[PDB]
Subunit: 81 residues, 2 copies
């Protein structure tokens, strides 16, 4: 009863270039969000993209195959919304 | 090991006015996001705000106290990111 997710946090321009990059690998995620942040907190590098996946296996394939620059923090988790 | 959440989906201008409204009730949520959407899907009314809470009790207080217009879909769930 959950959706496996990845969040990408960092600078909004890097994240934008990263999106160019992963639109080449569209079979490896189900959805990706516009770029957002928590209101009040992005005075930083605290911009975020969320991706959703069909399974944890598809998520592993994304992270195996899709190289994420080191200036971006990658967290994995789940959602049930 | 989870964060109770609310997502608000609907038109971005309504959501913006709603944010004016709930900044008056800031003790009743921990964080609220900028307005976002799933890329490709917002050709609609498919814009979104996420709020996070300290507990499910604080979430109930938010939804008890903070009236949400009917043009906005309110879903509740959890995240672990």
């Amino acid at each position: 009863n959950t959706t496996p997710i990845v969040e990408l946090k960092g600078d909004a321009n890097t994240l934008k270039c990263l999106r160019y990059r992963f639109k080449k690998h569209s079979t490896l995620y189900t959805a990706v969000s516009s770029t957002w942040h928590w209101t009040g907190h992005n005075v930083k590098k605290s911009a975020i993209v969320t991706l959703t996946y069909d399974s944890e296996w598809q998520r592993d394939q994304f992270l195996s195959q899709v190289k994420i620059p080191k200036t971006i923090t990658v967290s994995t988790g789940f959602m049930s919304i």
